[PDB]
Amino acid sequence: GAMAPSYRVKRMDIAKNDEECVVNAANPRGLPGDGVCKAVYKKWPESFKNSATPVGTAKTVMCGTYPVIHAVGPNFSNYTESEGDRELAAAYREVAKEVTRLGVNSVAIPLLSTGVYSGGKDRLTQSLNHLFTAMDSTDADVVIYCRDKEWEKKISEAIQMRT
Numbered sequence: 001g002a003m004a005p006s007y008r009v010k011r012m013d014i015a016k017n018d019e020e021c022v023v024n025a026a027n028p029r030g031l032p033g034d035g036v037c038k039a040v041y042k043k044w045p046e047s048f049k050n051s052a053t054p055v056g057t058a059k060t061v062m063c064g065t066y067p068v069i070h071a072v073g074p075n076f077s078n079y080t081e082s083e084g085d086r087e088l089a090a091a092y093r094e095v096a097k098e099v100t101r102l103g104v105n106s107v108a109i110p111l112l113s114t115g116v117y118s119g120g121k122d123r124l125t126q127s128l129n130h131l132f133t134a135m136d137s138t139d140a141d142v143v144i145y146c147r148d149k150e151w152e153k154k155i156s157e158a159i160q161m162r163t
């Protein structure tokens with residue numbers, strides 16, 4: 001575990017993270033995809049061997065000794081708000097299990113279902129709260145990666161509010 005487990009946020013490419021493992025915002029088919037998934041495919045392509053996994057699950061594949069946790073959030077274009085919410089919460093619980101099993105002291109994580117799977121809605125708060133629900137009982141340092149300056153501000157505020 002980390003000596004004083006924390007949450008942090010950084011506005012940069014998760015492919016350049018400084019953590020002991022990465023969560024991919026994966027698709028269910030293990031395809032290179034776009035956004036975070038394409039950056040992860042370019043940086044850790046070896047990790048996409050048999051990475052296909054259902055919605056609401058996480059599947060870890062090593063790239064060397066570096067773990068890539070493929071977490072499949074729902075595409076809210078396809079799911080009802082209710083079912084999508086359930087699967088998004090489930091994906092994060094499976095990430096917490098993996099992070100725990102791997103014994104890492106830190107993990108780089110994107111906000112699942114906030115990009116092309118958002119169904120054109122702002123899901124910062126919905127996705128972040130499910131991340132907290134899952135990760136609060138873990139003792140890894142969590143570093144959340146985002147790309148937008150206003151998202152960085154909002155995530156940083158939500159972290160600081162609970163401290």
Ligand SMILES: [Cl-]
Nearest residue numbers: 011012013016
């Ligand atoms: Cl960057």
Ligand SMILES: [Cl-]
Nearest residue numbers: 114115116117
């Ligand atoms: Cl997404």
Ligand SMILES: [Cl-]
Nearest residue numbers: 146147148151
């Ligand atoms: Cl973002």
